[PDB]
C-alpha cells in the first residue's frame, strides 16, 4: 500500500550492483561476480539453481521483479545470529573486531559502489557510537535496527 521512491531507489541500486552491464537482467556470470567479490566460490550450476528459484518467466535470468521476489525470500527468512556474524566478518576483513573506515571502503568497492573517501567516513561516524572512529560488532547490530 504505497512504496516510496527511496525504497524503489534502494532496490534499483542493489539490482544495478548485480546487473553490471545495465541490460536489465542478472545472469549467472553477474551473480557469480558479486558473490566472488564477497569471498565465495559458487559453481555455475549452483548459480543457475539460485536463478531458477525466482525465474518466473523461465528465460534463465533474473529481471527486476524476479529480483524483488528473491529479496523477499532470501533477504528475509533466515538471518538472526551466527550469520549476522558472517556478514560482519565480510566487513571486518582482517578479523580484529573493528570495521575500519578503509575496510568499509573495501566492501563497498567489492559490491560495485565506488563511493568517495569522504562518503566512507560519513558512514563510519553514523554508526560510531563509542567515539573510536570505528564500528565494532555491537554498533553494527544497532545500525541494522534503525531506519
Amino acid at each position: 500500500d504505497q512504496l516510496t521512491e527511496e525504497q524503489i531507489a534502494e532496490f534499483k541500486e542493489a539490482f544495478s550492483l548485480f546487473d553490471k552491464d545495465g541490460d536489465g537482467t542478472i545472469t549467472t556470470k553477474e551473480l557469480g561476480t558479486v558473490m566472488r567479490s564477497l569471498g565465495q566460490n559458487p559453481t555455475e550450476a549452483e548459480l543457475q539453481d539460485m536463478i531458477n528459484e525466482v525465474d518466473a518467466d523461465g528465460n534463465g535470468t533474473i529481471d527486476f521483479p524476479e529480483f524483488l521476489t528473491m529479496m523477499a525470500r532470501k533477504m528475509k527468512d533466515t538471518d538472526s545470529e551466527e550469520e549476522i556474524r558472517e556478514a560482519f566478518r565480510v566487513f571486518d576483513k582482517d578479523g580484529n573486531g573493528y570495521i575500519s573506515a578503509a575496510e568499509l571502503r573495501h566492501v563497498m568497492t567489492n559490491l560495485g559502489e565506488k563511493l568517495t573517501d569522504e562518503e566512507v567516513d560519513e558512514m563510519i561516524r553514523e554508526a560510531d557510537i563509542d567515539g573510536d572512529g570505528q564500528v565494532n560488532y555491537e554498533e553494527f547490530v544497532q545500525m541494522m535496527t534503525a531506519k
Binding site: K74, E83, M108
Partner: peptide, 19 residues
C-alpha cells in the same frame, strides 16, 4: 541509513544464497 542497510542486505543475501 541507505548506505549501511544496502551493503548489509546484499552481503546477507549472498550469504543466504550459498548453501
Amino acid at each position: 541509513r541507505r548506505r549501511w542497510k544496502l551493503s548489509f542486505s546484499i552481503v546477507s543475501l549472498c550469504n543466504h544464497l550459498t548453501r
